[PDB]
Amino acid sequence: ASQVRQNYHEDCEASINKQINMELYASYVYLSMAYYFERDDVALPGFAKFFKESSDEEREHAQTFMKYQNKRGGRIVLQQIAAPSMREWGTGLEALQAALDLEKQVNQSLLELHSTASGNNDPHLTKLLEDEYLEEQVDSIKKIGDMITKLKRAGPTGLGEYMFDKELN
Amino acid sequence: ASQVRQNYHEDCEASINKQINMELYASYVYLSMAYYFERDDVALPGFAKFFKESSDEEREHAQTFMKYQNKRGGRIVLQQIAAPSMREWGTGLEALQAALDLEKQVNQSLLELHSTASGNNDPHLTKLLEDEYLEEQVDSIKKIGDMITKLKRAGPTGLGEYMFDKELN
Amino acid sequence: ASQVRQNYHEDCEASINKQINMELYASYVYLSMAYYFERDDVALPGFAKFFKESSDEEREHAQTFMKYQNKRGGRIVLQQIAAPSMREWGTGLEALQAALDLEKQVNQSLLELHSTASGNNDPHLTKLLEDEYLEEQVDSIKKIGDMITKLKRAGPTGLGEYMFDKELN
Amino acid sequence: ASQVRQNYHEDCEASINKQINMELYASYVYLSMAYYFERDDVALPGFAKFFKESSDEEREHAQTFMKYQNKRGGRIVLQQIAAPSMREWGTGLEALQAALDLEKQVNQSLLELHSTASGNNDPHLTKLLEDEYLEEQVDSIKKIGDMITKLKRAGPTGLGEYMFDKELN
Ligand SMILES: [Cl-]
Ligand SMILES: [Mg+2]
Ligand SMILES: [Mg+2]
Ligand SMILES: [Mg+2]
Ligand SMILES: [Mg+2]
């Protein structure tokens, strides 16, 4: 084992590798959305910027798990990053709804990782998950939920979508 | 011939003079649009400003071709600048659609001159076209396409046109 | 077709989608290398920083192609990003040798795209490739070649690798 | 009991007293190392500085536990600080290896305290341990592991030790 490894269960190590891939996948979904909103026939620059920033944040979250794996003496195993399932994301509202679903899927995986860490009596890992992942995940879900409600109020299509996008920019 | 002339084909020289006239014509079209949008019964100051700036940019493009003709030792031949095809340009959307078509007509002319320059083995001229014209032309076409999509989303008439115009201003 | 599309061949559009994927793959390879060099049993922070920066630059290159696709009215079609071919990259020298080979593979792909663009008489695309890709690619290959020579001189293992890494940091 | 005491188990109080002593001992070990590296026949000022700083940090960790004991209404019971096990610490590498082992021994003790606190349903104490101790302990172990790898690469004796020490200074 690594000279640094202590109290680090193989199941936690393996689950962190799976979570790295999930965060990279989420980053790729948001990158797809960002550039979809820059198509000449879509032209929603506020949505584009929101998803660009979201993509960067998910990549940073993946990198924090990679750093964490090394800190604990685990070994990073990277796998293929699947392309998002659709080429086009529909209306701004449909993209936000897909993002909300994805954020909750990621949250569920993080909570399952927390359960694995707790069951293996790894408080360093439960602290990481609580402070660096679960907190931001709840804030992200709340933000997207607010945005969905605001967009339903404004529009969600036509002038209201145009105005909502401008406030988002 | 001019003491400076070297590798400069008469067909390229003549086509440059045609491009100068086309750019001056485009400048005149956009000047007409700019002041149409300042009529008391139109009153779209964002559209007016957009077309004023566009008119100035096309005049600058014409001047860069005039400077180029002199750099290569060709002789500038200026001709009449045709009146724009319309006295009144309709809605903001109709003006943008006319602008998109004009920008694509200009792009086609520039690409045809690029072909003439390539066929005459004139890389100084292909460089000029690529760097000083074709690049900005694609960016302009993309910008106007985005604007058309945004205006169709906002409006394209009534309150949405009013709001889109303000964002443009 | 898109309202903006002009002189943009479907084969060029498809090849741009391939290049986006290749750039994202290169970004992933360099990300893998960066964190390999942060393992507690590797501990080469100069190499880690070099590959982190390289990863970010390749992702930016991918994003510029995504923006380009939209500018021309093509449609981004993302593909799965393959896993890097190795979990462990060996010595610093072996990683640089792998990077040199990857940079030359990317260069070959860019030159093939350039040939496709030239054969389809698309000077906007040849300009993009020359100015935004081929130039930086030659500079990157020269930099890595220099680094390989310097590391062979210093080391390439032991104290020389330790000292070379410091200079890189 | 103290007027402030609430949900504070006597076993946790006693274990905090043990940890205070362990931290003071670690501080003394690192103080011994620091001055060993300032002997005229050792003369490794980077190692000396690293261990001086480490000694101060361990004393601060002990003081935070003393403050904590008082915050909860426990009573500080100090114990003799044992002499370090060696008068002479050998090579820089041997000292780092001894430090790694000591850091892991302290980590094990902190994890045992965490288990005691968790079993006694004391989340204020688990929070202290996670945030103020376990986090820095993993970072310290990773840093020392990196240093051991770097020193093995550089040297670990002779010129490599001289150069590694300079980088540490
Ligand atoms: Cl006329
Ligand atoms: Mg263990
Ligand atoms: Mg609606
Ligand atoms: Mg065409
Ligand atoms: Mg009580």
Domains of chain D: 1-169 (1.20.1260.10)
Q: For D29, what's the count of Cα atoms within 13 Å in the CB-facing half-sphere?
A: 22
* CB < 8 Å to D142, chain C: 40
Q: Give the Cα separation of D144 and D95 in Å (integer).
A: 10
Radius of gyration for chain A, computed over Cα atoms and rounded to the nearest angstrom = 18
| DSSP SS3 for D142 | helix
Which residue reads 């006693």 in tokens? D14
Q: Give the Cα separation of D153 and C155 in Å (integer).
A: 11
| DSSP SS3 for B29 | helix
Question: CA torsion angle for D23, D28, D30, D33 (degrees, to 10)?
Answer: -160
Whether the ω angle into residue C45 lies within 30 degrees of 0, i.e. cis, is no
Which residue reads 């929070």 in tokens? D127
Q: Do D129 and A123 lie within an 8 Å CB cutoff?
A: yes
Name C81's bridge partners: A81
User: How many other CB atoms are found less than 10 A from the CB of residue B23?
Assistant: 25
Q: Do A43 and B164 lie within an 8 Å CB cutoff?
A: no
> Among the residues of chain C, which ranges form H helices?
10-36, 45-72, 92-119, 123-128, 135-154, 159-168
CA nearest D153: which of C37, B80, A58, C132?
A: C37
Taking only residues 42 to 101 of chain C, the set having a beta carbon closer than 8 angstroms to any beta carbon of chain D reads 42-43
Q: Is B60 exposed, middle or buried (0-12, 13-18, 19+ CB in 10 A)?
A: exposed
The distance of C63 to chain B (nearest Cα, Å) reads 17
Q: Give the Cα separation of B96 and B117 in Å (integer).
A: 31
**Under 8 Å between Cβ of A71 and D142:** yes
| Greatest Cα-to-Cα distance within chain D, rounded to the nearest angstrom | 61
Asked if A14 has any chain C CB less than 8 Å from its own CB, the reply is no
| DSSP SS3 for A81 | strand
Q: What are the phi and psi torsion angles at D90 (to 5°)?
A: 80, -145
User: How many other CB atoms are found less than 10 A from the CB of residue B5?
Assistant: 11
Q: Give the Cα separation of C49 and B101 in Å (integer).
A: 49
Q: Which two tokens stand for residue A113?
A: 């990782």
Q: Give the Cα separation of A141 and A163 in Å (integer).
A: 22
* CB < 8 Å to B148, chain C: 3
**Under 8 Å between Cβ of C92 and D153:** no
| DSSP SS3 for A44 | coil
* CB < 8 Å to A123, chain D: 111, 114, 118, 126, 129-130, 134
**Under 8 Å between Cβ of B20 and B78:** yes
Q: Give the Cα separation of D72 and D74 in Å (integer).
A: 6
Q: Which two tokens stand for residue A32?
A: 């797809």
Q: Give the Cα separation of C152 and C94 in Å (integer).
A: 11
Q: Give the Cα separation of A167 and B2 in Å (integer).
A: 58
User: How many other CB atoms are found less than 10 A from the CB of residue B58?
Assistant: 24
**Under 8 Å between Cβ of D143 and D51:** no
Q: Give the Cα separation of D159 and D167 in Å (integer).
A: 13
The distance of D166 to chain C (nearest Cα, Å) reads 12
Task: Report residue B94 CA to chain centroid gap.
Answer: 17
**Under 8 Å between Cβ of D36 and D42:** yes
Residue A94 alpha carbon to ligand 5 centre in Å: 52
Q: Is C101 exposed, middle or buried (0-12, 13-18, 19+ CB in 10 A)?
A: exposed
CB neighbour list of residue B20: distance below 8 Å, 6 or more residues apart: B62, B65, B66, B69, B76, B78
For chain A, helix, strand, coil in percent to 5 are 75, 0, 25
Q: What is the phi-psi region of residue A43: left when phi exceeds 0, alpha when psi lies from -120 to 50, beta otherwise?
A: left
Name A81's bridge partners: C81
Q: Is C11 exposed, middle or buried (0-12, 13-18, 19+ CB in 10 A)?
A: middle
Which residue reads 């390289």 in tokens? C54
CB neighbour list of residue C109: distance below 8 Å, 6 or more residues apart: C18, C19, C22
**Under 8 Å between Cβ of C147 and B138:** no
Q: Give the Cα separation of C130 and C147 in Å (integer).
A: 24
Q: DSSP label at B25?
A: H
CA nearest D128: which of D70, D68, D77, D75?
A: D68
Which pairs count as long-range contacts for D147-153, CB under 8 Å and 24+ apart, including other chains? D147/C43, D147/D96, D148/A3, D148/D93, D148/D96, D148/D97, D148/D100, D149/C40, D149/C41, D149/C42, D149/C43, D150/C43, D150/C162, D151/D92, D151/D93, D151/D96, D152/D93, D153/C43, D153/C157, D153/C158, D153/C159, D153/C161, D153/C162
User: How many other CB atoms are found less than 10 A from the CB of residue A167?
Assistant: 9
In degrees, rounded to 5, the angle at the alpha carbon of residue A113 between the alpha carbons of residues A111 and A115 is 70
Q: DSSP label at B83?
A: P
Query: What's this structure's resolution in Å?
Result: 1.2
Q: Give the Cα separation of A58 and A61 in Å (integer).
A: 5
Nearest CA in chain A to B164: A162
Q: Give the Cα separation of C53 and C61 in Å (integer).
A: 12
